[PDB]
Design a protein around this nucleic acid. Structure first.
Lengths: 208, 82, 83, 85
RNA sequence: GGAGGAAGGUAUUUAAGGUAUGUUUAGUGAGGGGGGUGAAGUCGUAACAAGGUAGCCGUACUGGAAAGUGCGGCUGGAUC
RNA sequence: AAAUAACGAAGAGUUUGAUCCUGGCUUAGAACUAACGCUGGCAGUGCGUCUUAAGCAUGCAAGUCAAACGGGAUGUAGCAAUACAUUCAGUGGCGAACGGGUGAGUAACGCGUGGAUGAUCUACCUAUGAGAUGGGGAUAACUAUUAGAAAUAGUAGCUAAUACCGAAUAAGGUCAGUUAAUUUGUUAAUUGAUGAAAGGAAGCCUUUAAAGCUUCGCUUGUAGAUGAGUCUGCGUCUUAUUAGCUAGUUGGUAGGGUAAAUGCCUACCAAGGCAAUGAUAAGUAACCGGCCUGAGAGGGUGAACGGUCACACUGGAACUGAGAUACGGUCCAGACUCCUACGGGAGGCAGCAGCUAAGAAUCUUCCGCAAUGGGCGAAAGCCUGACGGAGCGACACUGCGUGAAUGAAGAAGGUCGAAAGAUUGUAAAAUUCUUUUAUAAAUGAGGAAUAAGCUUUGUAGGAAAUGACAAAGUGAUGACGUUAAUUUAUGAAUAAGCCCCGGCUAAUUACGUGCCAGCAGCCGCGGUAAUACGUAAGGGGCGAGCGUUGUUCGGGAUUAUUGGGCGUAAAGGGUGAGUAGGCGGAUAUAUAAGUCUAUGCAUAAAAUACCACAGCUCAACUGUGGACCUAUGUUGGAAACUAU
């Protein structure tokens, strides 16, 4: 995650939508609507269908901060089940542990939650885990490490994020114990929408 | 005695001694088009009694080798050519 | 050959698993299995032993030779089944 | 390559056993030959006696596993059948 | 004295080697033959219009060359 | 409106002044045991001479039994013997036919799968019926000696054994007759002929021997299990510009030989046998479970792993042995290498590492037998380059990090401009927070089971201990390893590049070059204003990787069974008569080869492939279950259609 050279203002500008849900990026959109580069104001020729599919794929990929190739594996796993492939894909992506922390509000951004989970702070179902690509299942627990500095850090984070964001109905958050409980896999309607998931599915159908 | 395989065929040669040649036709799959193909395979068979002659339909059984090629024995004559 | 009941190794580096198996002495450690009898998972904390008692008894009667490890697996499985 | 004491010893034992084996085998061949020749001579009674002797030799060797007991049995069959004639 | 036991001799079969004749296949070979690209060089103007002798097919003969002509066949032939 | 099922199929450029169709080429994707170029942090798992089956320095990879036997040497007791213990070689037992490597050869019962073996064998293992009574002769080792540089062969004398060879009786042996069954050489009974043998350690006590007894063994016999030989139905590459081939060739009668059938081999008797329904020949190739690709059908392919086969320098041959036509056994011939005292000898890394040569191209001359497996032994124990691990290579696969949160109408520079300003850009700077990784320390599971030995209980046995078995407890032992994981200590500290931007194909402007220099997969760009060349600024893609090349599939319905055509695009034979073959009116009955069904019942080893559930911090990876196809065999049915 060397994402120092992928300054996200450029991405939010090209997509024309705040895919990270951060007010600074809302402000950047307000200030400079045009796409990046010197030709940002220059009239752009019409985009091919391949371009639209790519735009949606990149929206999802940069929203969830997952390597494209890992996302390919995710789609290949989602397709293995019956049902709405887009729903399975979105559910698998959403149940990522760093994403779960972000939803619960224990972190500011998905990158922040990724660092938190990578730095060995999160405790999974009674054990320490250090990587952000865990796909939680139903009936699982996040605890916070037994260190006072970390506990105060998480409380500062949650007091910040509580106002800005909301708190999904498939997560049970207990700010007193710093406990997170995942009830069931999310439904499509209870997942915020930022891209056309079946355009993503169509894009990955080509890779066959 | 139990599962020795039996074959039914047409005697195509008799000018041997104590031996006949049986031409057997096997129906077989074609792996692709599924239509059958009639395959003609010729085997030698032991005929101790010179019972059978050219043109008739006989039945033969698997036995121990009796010669280099002869590995079948006569069991019965299903149809005798008049 | 001298039919023996032994452990055929499976699994990855530093995480062995064994299959309780019936197979000839001369046959390599991971070759043809005349029959399978169960599994033995030493790196697991639970369900470490599971063998087919009747089949193993039948093979012993036929004349198989138990390695020491499979012999004690049979003993320990008897103990845990009774318990 | 490196001379194995096992291999050298096995070669020595090979010669040792070969001498004894081949001696017994030649015994069998010649005794059998005398027997069939006076079967041909028709000397029924000492053909009897010599068949007794040769059968003794045959299955003595078979017990010693110099030759297979099936070989001994085959020789006895055929030779006794010829005397039956 | 069997034991012809065991060496030795003899004989059959046989590897390698030698000889002879055909046979499969890969390089090379004076010279010769056509093919392609580079030539937009030389000679002629055969085909595309009725291409200026309508065209073409099979066969035969002939000519620096495209080709010409005889016989039969076709329209996939203007014009009337 | 609806129900159910289906869980899965994308295009584009290019013939023309322009158009439609036909048609080839090219292209976006997924892969490989890959190589090369730029760049390069770590961890896990897997992989790593595809070419010269070319030649090989060196070390190791198969030994074990002293409780089978006679001796030598040593220490102790001993005067000497003899004992106790250690050690050496010899005789002998078992193993060495397993494990390991390679794919040269082999279009073949070799391989896959189902069977046949009344034509078969089978040491060690399990159960079990009977037994084990008495003699004799050599021989190594050893002591000398002959030939010899050594390798080594001999010679003479002495000695034992679970070594070798007779003898007495035999229990389910073999052979032959007879009878009884069974109907290829099967079984049972009778007679006749005829076949054996090994004892060593321990305890016991009549002093003891004796006598019986424990364990490991020996002779004979059967049964089971396992493996192997042989045969067979079916499947198993290309070229018919390979058309005739075979003369032990085809079959018969005897015989040779084999565990066993057969021209497997030999002697005679016939001329037969195979072949356009593809014989024979040439070329290529180990096969299969599988792998890659694909919606599927198919196509390509046979890395790793597992099974079978073949080979171990080239070409033969036999011996020992239950088992070999024997990788590190023997003999011979040939080439090559090496040592000679010139008489002659020694050697085969396609075992684990490693060297040279070849090649675009591939590793350490490492640790350990702790676990698993194997060999020997009563056991302790020994051996195990199998295997457990480590090191090396971004070679593939999987995961993680290189920061995170605030942060300006917006720093300097760079670039575009009319020199308002834009863009790089909240990016940086700055502030705050965190420590996966980095370093240090502490803590630290699990792979491990116990073995010998010891304690105790119970069973068989018996006069009884020693011992055997069943059970309980005690009982040394980790190469990996500074293990996985966990807890503190310091701080943004240790960490990004590569390709592309005319269309295909997501991404444009400014300079320099002027049909030169160059790009290119296709169409094609460059001749004085190049979004296509070269360099900068921006933008897109992926990321410790990114591109290129080689090979396979897909897009290609471009070999079309699913699913294409033949008037003019490539494609109807000049025409007819007919052989083989394919196909064919109506209707009745029977057979059940095809077809369908009970997705009966089995077989299709394991792994892999699909679906769930689990364990490695997750994933890869690993494990336990559950199935979907369709392939063969078989059982009982249905009969319309094809077939009889």
């Amino acid at each position: 995650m060397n994402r120092k050279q992928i300054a996200k203002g450029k991405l939010v500008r090209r997509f024309g939508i705040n895919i990270f849900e951060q007010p600074k990026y809302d402000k950047i959109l307000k200030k400079k609507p045009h796409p990046p580069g010197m030709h940002g104001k220059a009239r752009k020729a019409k985009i091919t269908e391949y371009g639209k599919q790519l735009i949606e794929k990149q929206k999802i990929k940069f929203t969830y901060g997952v390597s494209e190739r890992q996302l390919t594996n995710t789609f290949k796993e989602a397709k293995k089940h019956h049902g709405v492939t887009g729903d399975n894909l979105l559910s698998i992506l959403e149940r990522r542990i760093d994403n779960v922390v972000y939803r619960a509000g224990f972190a500011i951004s998905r990158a922040h939650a990724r660092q938190i989970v990578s730095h060995g702070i999160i405790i999974l179902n009674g054990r320490r885990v250090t990587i952000p690509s865990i796909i939680l299942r139903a009936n699982d627990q996040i605890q916070i490490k037994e260190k006072d500095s970390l506990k105060k850090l998480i409380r500062s984070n949650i007091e910040k994020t509580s106002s800005l964001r909301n708190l999904p109905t498939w997560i049970e958050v207990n700010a007193d114990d710093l406990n997170i409980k995942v009830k069931h896999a999310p439904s499509r309607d209870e997942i915020p929408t930022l891209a056309n998931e079946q355009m993503v599915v169509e894009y990955y159908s080509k890779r066959a | 005695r139990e599962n020795k395989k039996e074959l039914i065929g047409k005697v195509v040669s008799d000018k041997m001694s104590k031996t006949i040649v049986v031409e057997i036709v096997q129906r077989k799959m074609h792996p692709i088009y599924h239509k059958y193909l009639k395959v003609s395979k010729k085997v030698k068979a032991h005929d101790e009694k010179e019972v059978s002659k050219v043109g008739d339909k006989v039945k033969i059984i698997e036995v121990r080798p009796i010669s280099k090629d002869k590995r079948w024995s006569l069991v019965e004559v299903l149809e005798k050519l008049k | 050959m001298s039919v023996k009941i032994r452990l055929k190794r499976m699994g990855a580096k530093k995480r062995p698993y064994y299959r309780v198996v019936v197979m000839n002495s001369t046959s390599p450690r991971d070759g043809r299995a005349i029959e399978e009898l169960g599994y033995y998972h030493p790196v697991e904390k639970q369900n470490q032993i599971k063998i087919k008692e009747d089949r193993m008894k039948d093979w012993i009667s036929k004349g198989a030779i138990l390695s020491d490890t499979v012999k004690m697996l049979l003993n320990k499985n008897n103990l845990n089944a009774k318990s | 390559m490196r001379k194995n004491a096992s291999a050298l010893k096995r070669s020595r034992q090979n010669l040792k056993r070969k001498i004894r084996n081949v001696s017994v085998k030649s015994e069998l061949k010649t005794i059998e030959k005398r027997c069939i020749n006076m079967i041909k001579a028709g000397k029924k009674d000492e053909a009897i006696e010599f068949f007794k002797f040769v059968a003794k030799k045959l299955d003595t060797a078979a017990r010693k596993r110099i030759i297979h007991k099936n070989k001994a049995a085959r020789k006895k069959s055929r030779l006794n059948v010829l005397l039956l004639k």
